[PDB]
Ligand binder design. Structure first.
Ligand SMILES: [Mg+2]
Ligand SMILES: [Mg+2]
Lengths: 448, 448
């Protein structure tokens, strides 16, 4: 009955002295949102809301000002590394309070396709250090790389090409003549002397000059885990100021990795330069960076369902396959493919739980992982058991009406036809429409 | 027959770009040596040897030039943080090839007194980072502390007083008006969010943008040991240039400690400021600093013994208690106290091994430690068993003639008399002299 609204981005009230201090800083953009389409990008700084500067208003009233009651389109004054000022009109993303979207259902029925829809977390051993001077990083618009060590030309060119792509994507530009910043990289790869050719918790002893004796200290002595590494890897990025206080290191990120086998620094840089630079210009973690990867792929039609009476269309997105097919709100879905829809939420929930139970045998334990929400037994399907999974997935006992969301996968829909049949009834008139869905694919890589 | 010689210090050919590059840098001074008395100090840079600059000569011929054949006194041109040039005449420390000194014997019979004579190693979680500019740290002679945060005045005053003592000992001087350097400290103490109220090796998963998927990486995932810590401690020293390139951080040392209980940052600074500053100006370890503590206390008389015929005096140090008592080389020691000396080296070695075996029962297992040379079962004597240790230590079966080296300890000599009786025989004339020894005490704290 009441309509809920959202802005297509997540943000922080920045505590960083060098990037949009005590202002909203965008952390992530919601895919397929209006904020995305309007051109809002990660690490953007909200300077003003609807003409009022964010400094001239309390921190507690920023969420209300960003989601006004009467207004629908929020005018934003943005700053980033591309420009110091920019006007952006962000349209709101609204839905009915009782609407269940295909995005929500793709997440609820994710175990049909863990291969495409999951969340995972990881932590990187990055030490990120910035200048103690409260200089805004937005003052530096251009960069150049420091002189290449000819002994390592091949490697240094790969590293600098990775950093160049990351920084040009941020809105920074190369100027070899008079750069605002100089980029410097340092790296190391060699054997660990503390490796004993072997793979408990020890006490911490230190010398105390004040008492002229060795003493036990209540610190964790991790020195035994260090011995487990044969090799040591170091990789760092140094961003040196050339204009405000020349020679001052503005930002430095150093990765220190404990290695089991031999590893290539070029391969290491290719993977980690993009993860390391996610904290330039917005640094919030100094020692161990937490990341969250959320991936999702589903068949999109544009239909929203009633949270209570699920066989009822509550809305149809404006430029969607279901709209183009002629589906309209208040329609009643008789069936999707060969599966009836006149079931309760608990009928669907129980039937789904039965499917996961009865197909645990077709999962691959070599792929077992713990997802971001703490679930320990995530497994992909076994590649030699897809025909058996597809058959089990389509058993009427498991109420597979919503399995259409994953009809692009051969472990759900073996037939070479992603087009879904929707049998609707508006009043007493019964129609059958074939909806070829569009595939909504999305990956969000966010610093927690 | 041939006399061996040494210089009273250990050194490196420095690989540091900011401190005596490709020149000898003194690491440690040998206590009671001529180099010590001449005023050679740790981290001194040998600029010239006997008038010849160390740059104008090969690295391979520096040890020979430092220990000449014909010459006995080596004239050194030194540089440090106190002065850019200084003339130092270092006398050599010589001994006969067949001489066994009381210093050597104190180390060989150390298990009489582990409490006073042992070696231990420890590693500190210090990250030490220096400027990539090859500026000599000797260009900066004065310092001042940066403005105190009034919210933490009590703590910041303790920290700065510790750093002030360390740097003034190095030869640096305070100048609040126009300092060459500004010292800045940063610190943090709070609970670990990753602590689960609990006290295996996990795989490393990271996101690879090049392949748009999570991947296993051959890196050690230590994230489980991080969870064991309730609290996190950070403590850092920042040395900022004010004259050459103002604002440039020359040297920075950051300690990151994983804590079991609550801990005071003032107490932490008091202990670690002296360990952290041992790498200013000579930094050779960037990430995990290895230290070695060598302590020794023995009764010194000045007598040197023959490695083969041990009851024969091969030398008597010039200003020693044995010299003052009238002991002279070629004398024959009949007995020390009530213990005869006419035994072989294996007679003494076996008798000593029997004593350690038979007194293992009087050791305190609560004190068990692994020494620097890798011995796992080092234990001090049990404080309630000293009378029994003293009796066992003086049993003629264990040939305790050399136990006089530890006669100042009540677990060896219960009587309140540190004066030792030496019964000698020169030719056929037999004399008894009472030697009150001097107590040689020494602690060496060195970066490995
Ligand atoms: Mg190997
Ligand atoms: Mg506790």
């Amino acid at each position: 009955n009441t309509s809920i609204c959202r802005l297509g981005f997540t943000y922080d009230i920045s505590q960083s002295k060098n990037w949009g201090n005590n202002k909203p800083v965008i952390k992530s953009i919601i895919p397929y949102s209006s904020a995305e389409q309007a051109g809002i990008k990660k690490y953007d700084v909200i300077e003003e809301i609807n003409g009022v500067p964010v400094t001239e208003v309390s921190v507690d009233e920023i969420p209300q000002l960003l989601n006004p009651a009467g207004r629908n389109d929020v005018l934003l004054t943005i700053s980033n590394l591309s420009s110091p000022s920019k006007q952006v009109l962000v349209k709101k993303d609204c839905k009915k309070s009782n609407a269940i979207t295909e995005d929500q259902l793709a997440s609820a029925y994710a175990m049909y396709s863990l291969e495409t829809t999951n969340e995972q977390e990881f932590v990187c051993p990055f030490k990120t250090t910035v200048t103690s001077d409260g200089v805004d990083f937005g003052n530096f618009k251009t960069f150049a790389f420091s002189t290449i060590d000819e002994n390592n030309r091949k490697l240094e060119t790969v590293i600098n090409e990775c950093i160049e792509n990351e920084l040009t994507k941020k809105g920074l530009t190369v100027d070899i003549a008079k750069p605002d910043l100089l980029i410097q990289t340092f790296y190391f790869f060699d054997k660990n002397p503390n490796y004993l050719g072997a793979n408990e918790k020890e006490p911490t002893y230190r010398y105390n000059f004040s008492h002229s004796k060795m003493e036990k200290f209540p610190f964790l002595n991790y020195a035994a885990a260090e011995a487990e590494a044969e090799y040591l890897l170091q990789f760092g990025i140094r961003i040196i100021d050339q204009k405000d206080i020349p020679g001052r290191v503005l930002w430095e990120c150093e990765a220190n990795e404990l290695l089991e086998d031999s590893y290539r620094l070029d391969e290491y840089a290719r993977v980690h330069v993009p993860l390391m630079c996610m904290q330039y210009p917005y640094t919030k973690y100094g020692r161990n960076v937490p990341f969250k990867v959320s991936k999702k792929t589903y068949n999109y039609t544009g239909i929203s369902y009633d949270i209570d009476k699920l066989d009822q269309v509550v809305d149809v997105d404006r430029n969607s396959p279901a709209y183009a097919a002629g589906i309209r709100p208040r329609d009643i879905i008789e069936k999707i493919g060969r599966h009836k829809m006149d079931h309760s939420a608990e009928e669907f929930s129980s039937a789904y739980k039965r499917f996961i139970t009865n197909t645990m045998q077709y999962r691959d334990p070599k792929t077992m992982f713990t997802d971001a929400n703490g679930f320990k037994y995530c497994m992909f399907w076994d590649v030699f058991k897809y025909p058996q999974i597809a058959d089990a997935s389509q058993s009427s006992d498991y109420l597979p009406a919503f399995s259409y969301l994953y009809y692009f996968a051969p472990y759900i829909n073996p037939s070479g036809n992603n087009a879904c049949t929707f049998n609707i009834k508006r009043g007493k008139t019964k129609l059958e429409v074939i909806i070829r869905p569009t595939i909504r694919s999305e990956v969000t890589v966010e610093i927690k």
